[PDB]
């Protein structure tokens, strides 16, 4: 009949490095029904049992897992998790798929809401990923070896055979160029414009072993292990400090870029969007997403309305800190 959703966990008591690839969290292969998706972080956490191994979890479980497994910073975890949950999760059962649709999220919500998981393209997941192809080409969730080959190439060319901040700057730009030239539906605005810069530094800040204090750089063996196999490196120790998107500013600065997309269903036709969120206009992302939620839930009434109000508030608590102050919106009023 429904669940009453708890407020998000706070930061972990212990915030130092530790062994995360340990006896209680062994890698195991997929069973029938297990779900995986476009996030190598959540994928690895599920395949090591930090999340439920079936790849369906509550917001709270996702937050505690990203913190325990990788030392993802609390506010960043809140901002990402409730974004994903509002758009792609089931607010009544409080379950989110980290991939595509599954009966495991429970009785479906009223359309146009879907609870179709992080695979759903267009508002959250989008284009110019590092190891995933654009949705226009048919698969936005599976690892793509050709794209990983380019990851390797750019690491060879700019990072001495390792992935570092310099490589991220170059790879991010080049992937944008690839999508401009080949994808007539290419979008790079709003949520995607913000997430696309952070995602390129997560491998440096979170996938590099926490015992490495200087000259942080990711080997291709470790990259492959996480991005392709959903497996922590042997003896992997998480970041020694809570972390997220440190260095994303520098990635943008290496090749300044403006939100927009290919217009009129044609390649090599990128038009700027001046209304999109960007890095000096972050609250636009908040307002946009709240708009998107209204489109999904145009007139909720019961347990659903209640859980929407709570999840929206939860998200705001993170957004407010992360974005440096945003006026909370109340599209369904108060409880
Ligand atoms: C991601 O990973 C990559 C890959 O590892 C990593 O890249 C390193 O980046 C750092 C800097 O960002 C590099 O180190 C710097 O290299 C600068 C460029 O060096 C060239 O030019 C030097 C300057 O030459 C002067 O004199 C000659 C006359 O001899 C003249 O022609 C020139 O015009 C100029 O006036 C030159 O010395 C250097 O050649 C030396 O070194 C090579 C070895 O690379 C050797 O083979 C040569 O024989 C020679 O000894 C080269 O051609 C350099 O200018 C810069 O120096 C500054 O800093 C040092 C100390 O930090 C000071 O001593 C000095 O005052 C300078 O101000 C510095 O050394 C490094 O080489 C990169 N490594 C690689 C492999 O590319 C990224 O940093 C990583 N990213 C992140 C974010 O971590
Ligand atoms: C793994 O991921 C890769 C990368 O995303 C996928 O490969 C891409 O597949 C698409 C679809 O076939 C390719 O798109 C086509 O590209 C043509 C241009 O490509 C050349 O130029 C680029 C560099 O600019 C080179 O990298 C590339 O090797 C080529 O030499 C376009 O001309 C095509 O356009 C036509 O169709 C569109 C859509 O209908 C129209 O809008 C156009 O007007 C035109 O008629 C087209 O966009 C793309 O090039 C591929 N990239 C690479 C590097 O391979 C894999 O399919 C994916 N596969 C899996 C599952 O592993
Ligand atoms: C906390 C909740 C999280 C959510 C909801 C989430 C969601 C997502 C989604 C939807 C994508 C795909 C983006 C796209 O294609 O546009 C993605 C990509 C990514 N995520 Fe996560 N993520 C989370 C946490 C993490 C953590 C903790 C890490 C690292 C440890 C991480 C690393 C990545 C990376 C590297 C990518 C890019 C993959 C690629 O482009 O090849 N994420 N995430
Ligand atoms: C892969 C997870 C994406 C991170 C969360 C989306 C919003 C970005 C917040 C950081 C602002 C600089
Ligand atoms: Mg993508």
TrEMBL record:
Its cofactor is heme b. The keyword Cytoplasm does not apply. Residues 21-35 have a biased composition (Basic and acidic residues). The keyword Hydrolase does not apply. Keywords: Heme, Iron, Metal-binding, Oxidoreductase, Peroxidase, Signal. Mg(2+) binds at residues 125-126. InterPro entries: Chloroperoxidase, Chloroperoxidase-like_sf. Residues 23-253 form the Heme haloperoxidase family profile domain. Heme b binds at residues 39, 126, 130-131, 192. One of its GO terms (molecular function) is metal ion binding. Belongs to the chloroperoxidase family. This is Heme-thiolate peroxidase.
């Amino acid at each position: 009949q429904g669940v009453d959703p708890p407020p998000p966990p706070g930061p972990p008591s212990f915030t130092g490095t530790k062994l995360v690839n340990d006896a209680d969290h062994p890698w195991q292969p997929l069973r029938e029904g297990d779900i995986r998706g476009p996030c190598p972080g959540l994928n690895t956490l599920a395949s090591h049992g930090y999340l439920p191994r079936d790849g369906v979890a509550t917001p709270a479980q996702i937050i505690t897992a990203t913190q325990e497994g990788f030392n993802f910073e609390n506010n960043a975890a809140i901002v990402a998790t409730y974004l994903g949950h509002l758009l792609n999760g089931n607010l009544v059962t409080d379950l989110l798929s980290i991939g595509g649709a599954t009966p495991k999220t429970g009785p479906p919500p009223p359309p146009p809401a879907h609870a179709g998981g992080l695979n759903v393209h267009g508002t959250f997941e989008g284009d110019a990923g590092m190891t995933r192809a654009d949705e226009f080409f048919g698969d936005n969730h599976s690892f793509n070896q050709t794209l990983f080959d380019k990851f390797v190439d750019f690491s060879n060319r700019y990072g001495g055979g390792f992935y570092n901040l310099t490589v991220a700057g170059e790879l991010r730009y080049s992937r944008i160029q690839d999508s401009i030239a080949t994808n007539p539906e290419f979008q790079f605005k709003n949520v995607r414009f913000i997430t696309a810069y952070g995602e390129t530094v997560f491998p440096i800040n979170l996938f590099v072993d926490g015992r490495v204090t200087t000259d942080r750089k990711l080997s291709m063996e470790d990259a492959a292990s996480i991005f392709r196999d959903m497996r922590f490196p042997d003896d992997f120790h998480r970041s020694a400090v809570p972390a997220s998107n440190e260095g994303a500013d520098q990635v943008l600065a290496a090749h300044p870029w403006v939100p927009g997309g290919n217009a009129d269903n044609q390649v090599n036709n990128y038009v700027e969007d001046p209304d999109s969120a960007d890095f000096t206009h972050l609250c636009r992302l908040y307002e946009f997403v709240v708009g998107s939620v209204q489109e999904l839930y145009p007139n909720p009434t019961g347990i659903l309305r209640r859980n929407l109000i709570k999840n929206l508030h939860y998200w705001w608590t993170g957004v407010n800190v992360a974005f440096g102050g945003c006026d909370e919106l109340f599209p369904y009023g108060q409880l």
